[PDB]
């Protein structure tokens, strides 16, 4: 790698560590249990959900979901985490050299279509075959408990776990993920992009740094880059399917209210 190409790697990685509260290194330490014997409170049933909620009481009441169905209460808590991640993602994007310079319209489009791809890409870091971290690493909701919920709420996460399990097998660290996320954000393939040409160029540089980083970070996984290239397509479809389900949930659920910020994201997607 060259100087110019290096500063890009370093600048993106720092933005990642700075803007995202949870990251794979902290997550693996919690899911491993090698640095502490105080594991996350496990949420595996309604009983344990209600208990965990006693701590989230202030929040739930604040948004008036205290008495909503357990699925809707969960659906909503998941939205808040999404709204929070979109906020960090926006700051992270503004940190990628060349992003802030883009027409404000293209900035919106990029975040609009990339946010969820990045979200599920990053959510894998806190997922394993039995469940996933919640509430900043303090809780652990089981994969089984999620499939126990009633339809359609139980058809939301299972597909993500399936993806995460294959993605997690790639053994990427936070240095790989930062570049990977920046790439999914600066995608010249988005619908309605004004300056596809320039953005495509920006995407090339980032993609270039990614390719070279992967080679010197994972010398034994020769085709890891193209593998990640496939993962990018998989995430695209994954999110498309996710948008579909959320659409079904909206037109068929009285209390499935959608947070505004998220609302504008799904609109026309």
């Amino acid at each position: 790698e060259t100087a110019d190409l290096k500063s890009l790697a370093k600048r993106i990685y720092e933005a990642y560590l700075k803007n995202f509260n949870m990251n794979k290194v902290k997550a693996r330490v919690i899911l491993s249990g090698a640095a502490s014997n105080n594991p996350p409170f496990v949420i595996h049933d309604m009983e344990t959900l209600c208990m965990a909620e006693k701590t989230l009481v202030a929040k739930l009441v604040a948004n008036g979901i205290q008495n909503k169905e357990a699925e809707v209460r969960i659906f909503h808590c998941c939205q808040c985490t999404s709204v929070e991640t979109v906020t960090e993602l926006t700051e992270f994007a503004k940190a990628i050299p060349g992003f802030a310079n883009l027409d404000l319209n293209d900035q919106v489009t990029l975040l609009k279509y990339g946010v969820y791809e990045a979200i599920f890409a990053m959510l894998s870091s806190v997922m394993n075959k039995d469940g996933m971290l919640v509430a900043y690493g303090n809780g652990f909701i089981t994969r089984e408990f999620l499939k126990s919920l009633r339809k359609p709420f139980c058809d939301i996460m299972e597909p993500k776990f399936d993806f995460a399990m294959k993605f997690n097998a790639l053994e990427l660290d936070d240095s790989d993920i930062s570049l990977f996320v920046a790439a999914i954000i600066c995608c010249g393939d988005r619908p309605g992009l004004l300056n596809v040409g320039h953005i495509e160029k920006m995407q090339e540089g980032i993609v270039h740094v990614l390719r070279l980083h992967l080679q010197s970070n994972h010398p034994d996984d020769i085709f890891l880059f193209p593998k990640l290239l496939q993962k990018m397509a998989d995430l695209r479809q994954l999110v498309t399917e996710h948008a579909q389900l959320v659409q079904i949930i909206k037109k068929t659920e009285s209390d499935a209210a959608l947070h505004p910020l998220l609302q504008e994201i799904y609109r026309d997607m």
Binding site: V86, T90, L104, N105, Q107, V108, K112, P260, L261, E264
Partner: peptide
């Protein structure tokens, strides 16, 4: 116009 993304837009501007 694509500014039917007011909240997101504001995040892009202020923070």
């Amino acid at each position: 116009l694509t500014e039917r993304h007011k909240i997101l837009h504001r995040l892009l501007q202020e923070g």
